[PDB]
Amino acid sequence: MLSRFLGPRYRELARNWIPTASMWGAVGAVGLVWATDWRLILDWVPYINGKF
Amino acid sequence: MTNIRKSHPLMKIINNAFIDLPAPSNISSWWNFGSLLGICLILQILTGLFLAMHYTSDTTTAFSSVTHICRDVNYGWVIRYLHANGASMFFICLFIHVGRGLYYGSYMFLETWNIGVVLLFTVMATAFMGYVLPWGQMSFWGATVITNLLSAIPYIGTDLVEWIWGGFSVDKATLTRFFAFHFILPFIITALAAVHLLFLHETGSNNPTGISSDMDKIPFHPYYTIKDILGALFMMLILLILVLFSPDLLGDPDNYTPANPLNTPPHIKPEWYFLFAYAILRSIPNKLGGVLALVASILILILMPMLHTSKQRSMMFRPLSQCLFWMLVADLITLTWIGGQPVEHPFIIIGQLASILYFLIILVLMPITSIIENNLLKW
Amino acid sequence: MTNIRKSHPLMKIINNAFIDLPAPSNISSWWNFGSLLGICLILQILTGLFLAMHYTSDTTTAFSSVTHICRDVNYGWVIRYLHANGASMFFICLFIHVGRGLYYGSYMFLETWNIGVVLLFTVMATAFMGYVLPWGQMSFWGATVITNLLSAIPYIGTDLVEWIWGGFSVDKATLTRFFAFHFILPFIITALAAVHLLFLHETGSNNPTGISSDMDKIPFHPYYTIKDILGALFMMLILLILVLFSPDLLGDPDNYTPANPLNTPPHIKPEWYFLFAYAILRSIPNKLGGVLALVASILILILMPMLHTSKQRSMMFRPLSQCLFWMLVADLITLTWIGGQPVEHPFIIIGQLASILYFLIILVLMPITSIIENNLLKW
Amino acid sequence: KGFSYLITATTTVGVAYAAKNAVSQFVSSMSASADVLAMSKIEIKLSDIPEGKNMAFKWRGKPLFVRHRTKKEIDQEAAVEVSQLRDPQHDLERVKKPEWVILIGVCTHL
Amino acid sequence: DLELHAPSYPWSHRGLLSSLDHTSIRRGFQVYKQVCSSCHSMDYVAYRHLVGVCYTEEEAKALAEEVEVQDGPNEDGEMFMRPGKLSDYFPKPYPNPEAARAANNGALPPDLSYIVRARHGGEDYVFSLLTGYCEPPTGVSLREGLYFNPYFPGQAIAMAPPIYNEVLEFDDGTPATMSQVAKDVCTFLRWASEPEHDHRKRMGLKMLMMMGLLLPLVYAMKRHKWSVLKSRKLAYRPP
Amino acid sequence: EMFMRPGKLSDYFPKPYPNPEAARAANNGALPPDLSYIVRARHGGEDYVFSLLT
Amino acid sequence: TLTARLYSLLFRRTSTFALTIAVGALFFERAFDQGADAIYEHINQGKLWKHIKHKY
Amino acid sequence: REFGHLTRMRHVITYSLSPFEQRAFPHYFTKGIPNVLRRTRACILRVAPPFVVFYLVYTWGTQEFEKSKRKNPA
Ligand code: HEM
Ligand code: HEM
Ligand code: HEM
Ligand code: HEM
Ligand code: FES
């Protein structure tokens, strides 16, 4: 867990999974915003903010 | 080098029970009511716990605490009436589950059938003690009648009743201990359902033909997870119609009156899912014989394997046994109706003949009819 | 023919867990405290359920309900102080059990070690919420301090503290929901202990030498059932000495005073088995840094396998790391003593040095010293 | 594939709606009930409180003190030194609206 | 002895998705406050419960401030009377049940917070009782302080007829005929028994639409997974 | 009406003051504590109570 | 076609599938509550407190 | 009891289709309704009769009960 995973193939793996990871992070962010009705963020969504 | 779903010790057993379990390809909707029951259990534990966050079991506050839940706790009436009608859904599903077992010969799986009888008794005990918790007129007087039924036991009966009461009558001690037993019992039921499934998976499921189906098994996950989920959605639909459109349909108005030990309700009927047994117990004048008949009306489920004389496991190919089965269902509906009615001229004789038919079908008519069916098939 | 002990599906599980389980022939008295823990758990479920037969969680009656339990319920003082001193015994056994795991490298069993961390947290939550239930001065104000600690959390601290309270302060709703959680949590603890033993039995027990013992395994039943019975009897002796000769040794007199939100006690301390953490949190001036340290002091148990730098598993053949282990135990004793003391000179600097030293030992001194020992043995 | 996965995704959207409503209700039940939110929560006072008069109340279980310290007292407690106090506090900082100091009424000692 | 059961009245809230008429709830509170409350209690309803239902906050506060309420001991340890407040529950007409029965001919007037839910027939029953007083039929004699109500079990009620034409004045000018007064109070009593009635019905409508979407789509999901089994063909080719 | 009756075995010990406020009014602002648990609710117990009284 | 494009862009990848569900769930909660509330307030027009509060 | 060790089967051939190749509700009404009617006809003379007798018993019991509370000229 220090440098056995430190190499060219591992940076390629990182870049390969970065778009999937970032999409999943956006999924988590949107789900967290929607589940909690986080007005801080949600006050910006054009039609959704009508709820507030 | 391995699939975690199969190698990991916890995922191994989850996988073997709910994913890679070989299930018959042809089990029908009547087989959904197992998962429904497991869902009902879970629902009762969830709502109940959230009810337990506000309920207080003192006799000066129990009715008030329930009123507080239904009037001031945010979405407290949702949780309250979800719990109340989920108990009724639990018993609907239980009766359908046991009826399926009787109809298809599932009791031939001895260990799981016996665990199921234990589970039936424990669920009944749980629901009975929980119904006292609101501390309404029906709660109090139903506890009074069904606890006093235990004095009919010879020699040790009165001491047993007074010990269960914690006193001379149903009162504060009874209410607090009933809250404690009601809290703890569903977890014992959870463990017993786990043992139940452990015993069931030793053979897998029976199927509607009553014939072993190892040549046509399918994985549980894609097929019966989605089938069980749709069954759960339908159960939720019925439960939510009850909760959100007729919350009080399956209840008695007199439990909205606080308990009054000096004023007996003109009628004292237990919950509907006890009424058949109530009717059975009211059929025979003797106290002790009445109690013994009430217990036998459920202990008789332990006799189904010994009373099986048919060459075929299921009643799919047994027209006369189906006739008798639906007579038994109609007779149980008759006993429920009769137990909901006063003890008066027509209902006494109706309930008496209904109780006699209840036992005479299971113990007498069903085995003889199966023997006749055997001979009609030249075996 | 079969031996039903080995063939029966339930008895097979029991047989493999406590009868025919291969166990190391040399595990010491320190390996008894597992079976003590599971016994303590059972005792807590047994007495608590009997307390819950009389206790009521309304703030107008909780303290009175407990006085009634100890004064008028038959042997209710026995059940009550058995429950309180059994919580203390639970934590004594837990601390000794985790210390054994640390000393002998038992944390190299990753899954059962991590489940044990979960168990430690859940037992702590259960004991904390149970101590509020008598609704004494210490109950109320300890709940007040410990719950308002959570306001240090960024952006959601006040909202989550108020949600846990169900109101603007610690009050009636908090007491009732704490009773509900206190009831339910030990059964989740039971499930986690079962998972814990499932993960342990995958490899079996570690032994004091730290060397794999498969060439010298003995059956569990005759040897460790009798040894665990002797250990349980000794534990019962200590517990009953507490219950029958100094019921109030490990408690606080201010919880015999009903909770007064207007008056605060001169000293607001947790129970003894929280003081080491209460010291650490109180050592740091920053609210949130203090809470993070109070959490890291128990989350750091998750780091022990990654901190292991010795070629050997246990501490049996490493004098220098034994020295550090006993320094760690002494530092935990001084943290407990500091947490029982006011925040004034000189206990502040002593608590600071002890809080630094705890982490400096676990995170730094122990790894470097294992490396030095490695080189002293020329590997 | 689009037709089938469209069915699945619409199913998931509806299930997420239902789950959010259920979980929100169960979370909100643990949130302060309407009786809690209508008791001590707030207590607006009235102009009944005269000058330099401790009209007393019972909010939050705590007796509430409401006075109208008239000029001098305020200034006097500014004249009252901060360092001399055991608990260092500034009069104007204590009373955001100098004219009226509002302290919960209870002795802070046993 | 047979009993007379209440007919079914077309309450505007009878329908499956039909809410209560909140103007009838407001007039019904006026009826309770001015007619019933001298002898009946509503322990589980407070003035704050009226806000956003039939009264605004200022209006309900003035309604609370119209009464006087006893408050916890003062410094001297004496009780005292203070104006009502929104968080106060409806005043109890009698100090204890025994004084309640003493003020009658020995009967307890029930708490009305749940009277609609605690009776078979509900609002229909309460409307029938309030409007159903008549002189007893030949062969029937009642004791003093009892009145023949053919809908009351036993047909001998200790409550005298409480409502009559112009028993109160309604603030919207609604004529106070006996049946108008009874309809309003029975609406208010249904609300008092079930304050969640309207919200429960709105949630029921939402559940019905969500189910009318989810059940077909999950059924389609099940049949998509199961089509592999439902259409497969078997062939037996023994040697 | 509420009445006055001779005491009984099942009756608890009489209270000197109707509420805490009358107790504090009678004792110069101080509420005299309940003594059911006074020994248990003090550090030092009956030793403390003896030394306090003497 | 519309559903082919839908699958190609928003459904094929599971993470994009989940994102589509999360955004859809947000907008569905808004629209379905708005529509069902309008339906319930039209079924009960003139009876609800919102309908009559404008006089008090 | 796991897939691979359940039974011995020989000479049985299964033909299956992907769910993405087939319809989920094929002939749902034109064929489903005749099958529902066939199943109903197959089970009705065994299920219905006892519930008919229950309806008759319920009707008679309720009616007789309400006639036993009526007044008699005696
Ligand atoms: C706590 C309540 C119960 C739960 C959660 C439960 C759960 C289950 C589940 C999940 C199944 C497998 C799915 C199914 O076929 O339905 C099952 C099957 C079974 N249960 Fe139950 N059950 C309960 C009560 C009972 C009762 C009361 C009995 C009757 C004595 C019983 C006897 C059986 C039998 C015999 C089977 C096998 C049926 C077959 O395969 O044909 N169970 N149970
Ligand atoms: C086997 C599962 C359960 C069943 C069948 C069950 C059944 C019932 C029933 C019938 C009632 C009376 C409902 C009414 O008021 O009309 C009730 C009440 C109650 N139950 Fe449960 N229950 C179950 C599980 C639980 C659990 C696990 C808890 C505690 C965590 C719980 C807590 C309560 C409480 C507090 C009440 C009183 C408040 C109320 O009336 O709703 N229940 N239960
Ligand atoms: C609910 C409380 C707990 C119970 C009932 C429990 C139960 C047990 C039992 C019976 C054993 C086997 C006997 C023994 O070696 O002592 C055991 C072993 C073990 N437990 Fe626990 N335990 C609990 C909490 C913990 C905690 C807090 C930890 C540490 C974080 C932990 C980690 C372990 C480890 C590592 C072992 C294996 C020890 C070895 O074989 O050397 N457990 N536990
Ligand atoms: C994990 C096991 C448990 C622990 C560690 C635990 C801990 C505690 C503690 C420390 C107290 C305060 C004792 C005192 O008054 O000084 C307490 C009180 C209480 N516990 Fe538990 N408890 C446990 C399990 C249970 C269970 C399972 C129940 C219910 C079935 C229960 C019911 C009670 C009750 C009713 C009280 C209040 C009575 C009293 O204060 O003595 N406990 N618990
Ligand atoms: S602080 Fe008021 S008494 Fe010392």
Coordinates of C-alpha atoms in Angstrom, one line a residue, chain C:
Chain C
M1 CA -26.6 -44.1 11.4
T2 CA -25.3 -40.7 12.4
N3 CA -24.4 -38.8 15.5
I4 CA -27.2 -36.2 15.5
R5 CA -24.8 -33.8 17.3
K6 CA -22.7 -33.8 14.0
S7 CA -25.5 -34.3 11.5
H8 CA -28.4 -32.2 12.8
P9 CA -28.3 -28.7 11.1
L10 CA -28.7 -26.7 14.3
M11 CA -26.7 -29.1 16.4
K12 CA -24.0 -29.2 13.7
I13 CA -23.5 -25.4 14.1
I14 CA -23.5 -25.7 17.9
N15 CA -21.1 -28.6 17.7
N16 CA -18.6 -26.8 15.5
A17 CA -18.8 -23.6 17.7
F18 CA -18.4 -25.0 21.2
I19 CA -17.9 -28.8 21.3
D20 CA -15.7 -30.1 18.5
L21 CA -14.1 -26.7 17.8
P22 CA -10.3 -27.2 17.7
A23 CA -8.8 -24.8 20.3
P24 CA -5.2 -24.1 21.2
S25 CA -4.1 -26.2 24.2
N26 CA -2.2 -23.3 25.7
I27 CA -4.5 -20.3 25.7
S28 CA -4.3 -18.6 29.1
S29 CA -6.8 -17.1 31.5
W30 CA -6.8 -14.0 29.3
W31 CA -8.6 -16.0 26.7
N32 CA -11.4 -16.5 29.2
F33 CA -12.7 -12.9 28.8
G34 CA -14.4 -13.7 25.5
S35 CA -16.7 -16.1 27.3
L36 CA -17.1 -13.6 30.1
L37 CA -18.2 -10.9 27.7
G38 CA -20.9 -13.1 26.1
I39 CA -22.0 -14.0 29.6
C40 CA -22.1 -10.4 30.7
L41 CA -24.2 -9.6 27.6
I42 CA -26.7 -12.3 28.6
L43 CA -26.8 -11.0 32.2
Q44 CA -27.4 -7.5 31.0
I45 CA -30.3 -8.7 28.7
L46 CA -31.7 -10.8 31.6
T47 CA -31.7 -8.2 34.3
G48 CA -32.6 -5.3 32.0
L49 CA -35.6 -7.0 30.6
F50 CA -36.7 -7.6 34.2
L51 CA -36.0 -3.9 35.0
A52 CA -38.0 -3.0 31.9
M53 CA -41.0 -4.9 33.4
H54 CA -41.3 -2.1 36.0
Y55 CA -39.4 0.9 34.6
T56 CA -41.2 3.7 32.8
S57 CA -39.4 6.2 30.6
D58 CA -41.6 9.3 31.2
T59 CA -39.5 12.0 33.0
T60 CA -42.2 12.3 35.6
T61 CA -41.8 8.7 36.7
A62 CA -38.4 7.3 35.6
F63 CA -36.5 8.1 38.9
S64 CA -39.6 7.1 40.8
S65 CA -39.9 3.9 38.8
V66 CA -36.4 3.0 39.7
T67 CA -36.9 3.7 43.4
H68 CA -40.0 1.5 43.2
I69 CA -37.9 -1.2 41.6
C70 CA -35.3 -1.1 44.4
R71 CA -37.8 -0.6 47.2
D72 CA -41.0 -2.6 46.5
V73 CA -40.4 -5.0 43.7
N74 CA -39.4 -8.3 45.1
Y75 CA -35.6 -8.6 44.8
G76 CA -35.7 -5.6 42.5
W77 CA -32.7 -4.1 44.3
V78 CA -30.8 -7.3 43.4
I79 CA -31.8 -7.0 39.7
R80 CA -31.1 -3.3 39.6
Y81 CA -27.6 -3.3 41.1
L82 CA -26.7 -6.6 39.3
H83 CA -27.5 -4.6 36.1
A84 CA -25.5 -1.6 37.1
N85 CA -22.4 -3.5 38.3
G86 CA -22.8 -5.9 35.4
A87 CA -22.4 -2.9 33.1
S88 CA -19.2 -2.1 35.0
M89 CA -18.1 -5.8 34.7
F90 CA -18.9 -5.7 31.0
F91 CA -16.5 -2.8 30.5
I92 CA -13.8 -4.4 32.7
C93 CA -14.0 -7.6 30.6
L94 CA -14.0 -5.5 27.4
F95 CA -10.9 -3.6 28.4
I96 CA -9.1 -6.7 29.4
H97 CA -10.2 -8.4 26.2
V98 CA -9.0 -5.6 24.0
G99 CA -5.7 -5.5 26.0
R100 CA -5.2 -9.2 25.3
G101 CA -5.9 -8.6 21.6
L102 CA -3.3 -5.9 21.6
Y103 CA -0.6 -7.7 23.6
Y104 CA -0.9 -11.0 21.7
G105 CA -1.4 -9.5 18.2
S106 CA -4.9 -10.9 17.9
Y107 CA -5.8 -7.9 15.7
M108 CA -4.1 -9.9 12.9
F109 CA -7.5 -11.5 12.7
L110 CA -8.7 -8.6 10.7
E111 CA -12.4 -9.3 10.4
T112 CA -13.1 -10.3 14.0
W113 CA -10.9 -7.5 15.2
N114 CA -12.9 -4.9 13.2
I115 CA -16.2 -6.5 14.3
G116 CA -14.8 -6.2 17.8
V117 CA -14.2 -2.4 17.3
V118 CA -17.9 -2.2 16.2
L119 CA -18.9 -4.1 19.3
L120 CA -16.9 -1.8 21.5
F121 CA -18.7 1.2 20.0
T122 CA -22.1 -0.4 20.3
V123 CA -21.6 -1.4 24.0
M124 CA -20.4 2.1 24.8
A125 CA -23.6 3.6 23.1
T126 CA -25.8 1.2 25.0
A127 CA -24.2 1.9 28.4
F128 CA -24.3 5.6 27.8
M129 CA -28.0 5.7 26.9
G130 CA -28.8 3.3 29.7
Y131 CA -27.2 5.5 32.3
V132 CA -29.5 8.4 31.4
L133 CA -32.6 6.2 32.2
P134 CA -32.7 6.6 36.0
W135 CA -33.0 10.4 35.3
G136 CA -30.7 11.4 38.2
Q137 CA -28.6 14.5 38.2
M138 CA -25.7 12.7 36.6
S139 CA -28.0 11.0 34.1
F140 CA -29.3 14.3 32.9
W141 CA -26.1 16.4 33.0
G142 CA -23.9 13.7 31.5
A143 CA -26.4 13.3 28.7
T144 CA -26.3 17.1 28.4
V145 CA -22.5 17.4 28.1
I146 CA -22.0 14.4 25.9
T147 CA -24.8 15.2 23.5
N148 CA -23.8 18.9 23.2
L149 CA -20.3 17.7 22.3
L150 CA -21.7 16.8 18.9
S151 CA -22.5 20.5 18.2
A152 CA -18.7 20.8 17.4
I153 CA -19.4 19.0 14.1
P154 CA -19.1 21.5 11.2
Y155 CA -22.3 22.8 9.6
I156 CA -24.7 20.1 10.9
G157 CA -23.7 19.9 14.6
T158 CA -26.6 21.9 16.1
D159 CA -29.1 20.3 13.7
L160 CA -28.0 16.8 14.5
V161 CA -27.9 17.4 18.3
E162 CA -31.4 18.9 18.2
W163 CA -32.6 15.9 16.1
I164 CA -31.1 13.5 18.6
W165 CA -32.7 15.4 21.5
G166 CA -36.0 15.8 19.7
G167 CA -36.1 19.3 21.1
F168 CA -34.2 22.3 22.3
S169 CA -32.4 20.4 25.1
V170 CA -32.1 17.0 26.8
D171 CA -35.7 16.3 27.9
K172 CA -38.6 13.8 27.9
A173 CA -38.3 12.9 24.2
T174 CA -34.6 12.2 24.7
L175 CA -35.3 9.9 27.7
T176 CA -38.0 7.9 25.9
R177 CA -36.0 7.4 22.7
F178 CA -32.9 6.5 24.8
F179 CA -35.0 3.8 26.5
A180 CA -36.0 2.5 23.1
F181 CA -32.5 2.5 21.8
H182 CA -31.2 1.0 25.0
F183 CA -33.7 -1.8 24.7
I184 CA -33.0 -2.6 21.1
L185 CA -29.2 -2.2 20.9
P186 CA -28.0 -5.2 23.0
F187 CA -29.8 -7.5 20.5
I188 CA -27.9 -5.9 17.6
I189 CA -24.8 -6.5 19.9
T190 CA -25.8 -10.2 20.1
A191 CA -26.0 -10.4 16.3
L192 CA -22.6 -8.7 16.0
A193 CA -21.1 -11.1 18.5
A194 CA -22.4 -14.0 16.5
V195 CA -20.8 -12.5 13.3
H196 CA -17.7 -12.0 15.4
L197 CA -17.5 -15.6 16.4
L198 CA -18.2 -16.6 12.8
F199 CA -15.2 -14.7 11.7
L200 CA -13.0 -16.0 14.5
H201 CA -13.8 -19.6 13.9
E202 CA -12.5 -19.2 10.3
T203 CA -9.0 -19.4 11.7
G204 CA -9.5 -20.3 15.4
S205 CA -8.0 -18.7 18.4
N206 CA -4.5 -17.2 18.6
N207 CA -2.4 -18.3 21.5
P208 CA 0.1 -16.6 23.9
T209 CA 3.2 -17.7 21.9
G210 CA 1.8 -16.1 18.8
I211 CA 2.7 -19.2 16.8
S212 CA 0.2 -21.3 14.9
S213 CA -1.0 -24.1 17.1
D214 CA -2.6 -26.5 14.7
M215 CA -0.3 -29.3 15.7
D216 CA -1.6 -29.1 19.3
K217 CA -5.3 -28.4 19.0
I218 CA -7.6 -29.9 21.7
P219 CA -11.4 -30.1 21.5
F220 CA -13.2 -27.2 23.0
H221 CA -15.9 -29.0 25.0
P222 CA -14.3 -30.8 28.0
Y223 CA -11.4 -28.4 28.4
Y224 CA -12.6 -24.9 27.7
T225 CA -16.2 -25.4 28.7
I226 CA -15.0 -26.3 32.2
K227 CA -12.3 -23.6 32.1
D228 CA -14.8 -21.0 30.9
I229 CA -17.2 -22.2 33.7
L230 CA -14.5 -21.6 36.3
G231 CA -13.8 -18.2 34.8
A232 CA -17.5 -17.4 34.9
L233 CA -17.8 -18.4 38.5
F234 CA -14.8 -16.2 39.4
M235 CA -16.4 -13.3 37.5
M236 CA -19.7 -14.0 39.3
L237 CA -17.8 -13.8 42.6
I238 CA -16.5 -10.3 41.8
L239 CA -19.8 -9.2 40.5
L240 CA -21.7 -10.4 43.6
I241 CA -19.1 -8.9 45.9
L242 CA -19.9 -5.6 44.2
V243 CA -23.6 -6.1 44.3
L244 CA -23.9 -7.4 47.9
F245 CA -21.0 -5.6 49.7
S246 CA -20.4 -2.3 47.9
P247 CA -23.4 -1.6 45.6
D248 CA -22.4 2.0 45.1
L249 CA -18.6 1.6 44.8
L250 CA -18.4 2.4 41.1
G251 CA -21.3 4.8 40.9
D252 CA -22.0 8.4 41.9
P253 CA -24.2 9.7 44.7
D254 CA -25.6 12.6 42.6
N255 CA -27.7 10.1 40.6
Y256 CA -29.7 9.5 43.8
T257 CA -30.8 13.1 43.3
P258 CA -33.5 13.5 40.7
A259 CA -32.5 15.5 37.6
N260 CA -32.5 19.2 38.1
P261 CA -32.1 21.2 34.8
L262 CA -31.9 24.4 36.9
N263 CA -29.0 23.2 39.1
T264 CA -25.9 21.6 37.8
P265 CA -23.7 19.3 39.8
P266 CA -20.3 20.7 40.8
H267 CA -18.7 17.8 39.0
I268 CA -20.1 16.3 35.8
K269 CA -18.1 13.2 35.0
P270 CA -19.1 10.1 32.8
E271 CA -18.9 6.7 34.2
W272 CA -15.5 5.3 35.0
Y273 CA -15.3 3.3 31.7
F274 CA -15.6 6.6 29.8
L275 CA -13.1 8.7 31.8
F276 CA -10.0 7.8 29.8
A277 CA -11.8 9.2 26.7
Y278 CA -13.2 12.1 28.6
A279 CA -9.7 13.0 29.7
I280 CA -8.4 13.0 26.1
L281 CA -11.2 15.2 24.8
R282 CA -10.8 17.5 27.7
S283 CA -7.0 17.8 27.1
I284 CA -7.5 19.6 23.7
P285 CA -8.7 23.2 24.0
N286 CA -10.5 23.1 20.7
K287 CA -14.1 21.7 20.8
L288 CA -13.9 19.8 17.5
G289 CA -10.3 18.8 17.9
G290 CA -11.2 17.4 21.3
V291 CA -14.2 15.4 19.9
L292 CA -11.9 14.1 17.1
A293 CA -9.4 13.0 19.6
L294 CA -12.1 11.3 21.7
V295 CA -13.1 9.4 18.6
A296 CA -9.6 8.6 17.4
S297 CA -8.7 7.2 20.8
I298 CA -11.1 4.3 19.9
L299 CA -10.8 4.3 16.1
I300 CA -7.0 3.9 16.5
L301 CA -7.8 0.2 17.3
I302 CA -8.5 -0.2 13.6
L303 CA -5.0 0.9 12.8
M304 CA -3.1 -1.8 14.9
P305 CA -2.7 -4.3 12.1
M306 CA -1.2 -1.6 9.8
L307 CA 1.0 -0.4 12.7
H308 CA 2.4 -3.9 13.3
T309 CA 6.1 -3.8 12.4
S310 CA 7.4 -6.9 14.3
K311 CA 8.4 -10.2 12.7
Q312 CA 6.6 -11.8 15.7
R313 CA 2.8 -11.8 16.3
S314 CA 2.5 -11.6 20.1
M315 CA 4.4 -9.7 22.8
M316 CA 5.6 -12.9 24.6
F317 CA 9.1 -12.7 23.2
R318 CA 9.6 -8.9 23.0
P319 CA 10.5 -7.3 26.3
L320 CA 10.8 -3.8 24.9
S321 CA 7.3 -3.8 23.5
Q322 CA 6.0 -5.4 26.7
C323 CA 7.5 -2.3 28.5
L324 CA 5.6 -0.1 26.1
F325 CA 2.4 -2.1 26.5
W326 CA 2.5 -1.7 30.3
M327 CA 3.3 2.0 29.9
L328 CA 0.1 2.2 27.7
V329 CA -1.9 0.5 30.4
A330 CA -0.5 2.9 33.0
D331 CA -1.3 5.9 30.7
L332 CA -4.9 4.6 30.4
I333 CA -5.1 4.4 34.2
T334 CA -3.8 7.9 34.5
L335 CA -6.3 9.1 31.8
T336 CA -9.1 7.5 33.8
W337 CA -7.9 9.2 37.0
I338 CA -7.5 12.6 35.2
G339 CA -11.0 12.3 33.8
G340 CA -12.3 11.8 37.3
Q341 CA -10.7 15.1 38.4
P342 CA -11.5 18.8 37.9
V343 CA -10.0 20.7 35.0
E344 CA -7.5 22.7 37.1
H345 CA -3.8 22.7 38.0
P346 CA -2.1 20.3 37.9
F347 CA -4.4 17.7 36.3
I348 CA -4.5 19.7 33.1
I349 CA -0.8 19.3 32.1
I350 CA -0.9 15.7 33.4
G351 CA -3.9 15.0 31.2
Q352 CA -2.2 16.7 28.2
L353 CA 1.0 14.6 28.6
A354 CA -1.1 11.4 29.1
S355 CA -3.2 12.2 26.0
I356 CA -0.2 12.9 23.9
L357 CA 1.6 9.8 25.3
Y358 CA -1.3 7.4 24.4
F359 CA -1.1 8.3 20.7
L360 CA 2.7 8.6 20.8
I361 CA 2.9 5.1 22.1
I362 CA 0.4 3.4 19.8
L363 CA 1.3 5.3 16.6
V364 CA 5.1 5.9 17.0
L365 CA 6.9 4.2 19.9
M366 CA 5.4 0.8 19.4
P367 CA 6.2 0.6 15.7
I368 CA 9.8 1.9 16.0
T369 CA 10.4 -0.3 19.0
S370 CA 9.2 -3.4 17.1
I371 CA 11.6 -2.4 14.3
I372 CA 14.5 -2.1 16.8
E373 CA 13.6 -5.5 18.2
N374 CA 13.6 -6.9 14.7
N375 CA 17.1 -5.8 14.1
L376 CA 18.3 -7.0 17.5
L377 CA 17.2 -10.5 16.4
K378 CA 19.0 -9.9 13.1
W379 CA 16.0 -9.9 10.8

